[PDB]
Amino acid sequence: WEIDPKDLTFLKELGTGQFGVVKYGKWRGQYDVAIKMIKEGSMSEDEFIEEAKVMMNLSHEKLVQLYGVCTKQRPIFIITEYMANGCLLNYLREMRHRFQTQQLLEMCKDVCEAMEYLESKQFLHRDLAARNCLVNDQGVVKVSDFGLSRYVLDSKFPVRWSPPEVLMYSKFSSKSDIWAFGVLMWEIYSLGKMPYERFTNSETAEHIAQGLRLYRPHLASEKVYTIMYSCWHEKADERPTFKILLSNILDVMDEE
Ligand SMILES: CC1(C(=O)N2CCC[C@@H](c3nc(-c4ccc(C(=O)Nc5cc(C(F)(F)F)ccn5)cc4)c4c(N)nccn34)C2)COC1
Ligand SMILES: [Cl-]
Numbered sequence: 001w002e003i004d005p006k007d008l009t010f011l012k013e014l015g016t017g018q019f020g021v022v023k024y025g026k027w028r029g030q031y032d033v034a035i036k037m038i039k040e041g042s043m044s045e046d047e048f049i050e051e052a053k054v055m056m057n058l059s060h061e062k063l064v065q066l067y068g069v070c071t072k073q074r075p076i077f078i079i080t081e082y083m084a085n086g087c088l089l090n091y092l093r094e095m096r097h098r099f100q101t102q103q104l105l106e107m108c109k110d111v112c113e114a115m116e117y118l119e120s121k122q123f124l125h126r127d128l129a130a131r132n133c134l135v136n137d138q139g140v141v142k143v144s145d146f147g148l149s150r151y152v153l154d155s156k157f158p159v160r161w162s163p164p165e166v167l168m169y170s171k172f173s174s175k176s177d178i179w180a181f182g183v184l185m186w187e188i189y190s191l192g193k194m195p196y197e198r199f200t201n202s203e204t205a206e207h208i209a210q211g212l213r214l215y216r217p218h219l220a221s222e223k224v225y226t227i228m229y230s231c232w233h234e235k236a237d238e239r240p241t242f243k244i245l246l247s248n249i250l251d252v253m254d255e256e
Contacts, residue, residue: 001052001053001056001068001069002068002069002070002071002072003027003067003068003069003070003077003079004070005070005073005077007027007028008025008026008027008033008035008070008077008079009025009026009029010023010024010025010035011023011024011025011026012024012025014034014086017036017087017145018127018131018132018145018148019036019038019039019042019043019145019148019152020036020037020038020039020042020075021036021037021039022034022035022036022037023035023037024082027067027079032082032084033067033079033080033081033082034079034080034081034082034083035077035078035079035080036077036078036080037075037076037077038075038076038077038078039075040074040075041153042152042153043076043151043152043153044151044152044153045076045151047150047151048076048148048151049069049071049076051147051150051151052066052069052078053069055146055147056068056069058117058118058121058123058146060113060114060117061113061142062110062111062113062114062117062140062141062142062143063114063117063118063142063143063144063146064080064081064083064134064142064143064144065080065081066078066079066080066081067079067080067081080144081136081142083134083135083136083142083144084135084136084137085134085135085136085137085139086134086135087130087131087132087133087134087135088107088130088131088132088133088134088135088141088188089129089130089131089133089187089192090192091135091192092130092187092188092191092192093191093192095191099191101219101221101224101256102253102256103139104188104189104219105224105249105252105253105256106141106253107141107188108184108185108188108249109246109249109250109253110140110141110142111128111133111141111143111181111184112181112242112245112246112249113246114142114143115128115143115177115181115242115245116241116242116243116245116246118143118146118177118242119174119177119241119242119243122174123146123147124146124147124172124173124174124176124177125143125145125146125147125177125180126146126147126148126149126150126172126176126177127145127148127149127158127161127180128143128146128161128177128180128181128184129158129161129180129183129184129187130184130187130188130192132144132145133184157201158180159201159204159205160183160194160195160196160201160204161179161180161183161184161195162176162179162180162208163175163176163179163208163232163236164208164209164234165236166179167205167208167209168209171236173236174241175236175237175239176236177242178231178239178240178241178242178245179231179232179239181231181242181245182228182229182230182231182232183195183214183231185220185224185227185228185231186214186217186220186228189217189218189219189220189224189228190217190219191219193217195214196214211234213229213232214228214232221252221256223252223255223256224252224256227245227248227249227252230245230248231245
């Protein structure tokens, strides 16, 4: 999985992402790639490198494709699929798109397929959120930065995407990714509002401890809201699987 860094040509600076700066470039003079440069001193490097190599074997149309790494230098580079329309959160917030609700539901379908695949590999994302999803030139949404929070050494914790058992007991599971997916659906249908937008993280955790929830964005139909709401059952084991959520999303697409 080691890419020769001399096969890379850097062409545009894209800004700072989670975990470090990202550039647009070409691999072998020809093929578009993104290059993420891991901030020095930020990662448990040996762990990160061993898992990166494992994660290289994950492949799905709706996961941002990992191509390779450059680890014989510092900073470490990660070479991935280039997603021309950038972060989903920013894309949602661009009012110029004038999105139809069918487009919003398709964004949810895209993410749900990626998550069903990760679930089928028993691999948790751990920080699923619109900020971490990316959009390609065809408007397809793909999931990225899965698993990576595990290597960050060591105000940043995803309180607003976490279920009660995480906030109270640090109980992480497939069902905490389910919860997060529901919040992501809310982000999509709210055109990128911050969840609990007028609450602090502290206030959010307290509201969640009291059993209270996000409510229906204006653009979410009753059927769509029912799906996102199902991700927030108090009891983790009554929350659906990604396979069930996908089937529910497909049914709505076929109806609405
Ligand atoms: C300018 C804005 C933006 O679009 N951003 C933030 C700056 C970075 C931008 C960005 N970030 C990325 C990006 C690149 C690489 C990774 C990555 O390394 N993911 C990864 C790596 C691993 C591994 F273990 F291999 F390290 C695992 C999982 N996921 C993640 C995200 C990409 C991309 N692929 N195309 C285009 C743009 N990309 C997105 C912010 O508001 C719009
Ligand atoms: Cl940059």
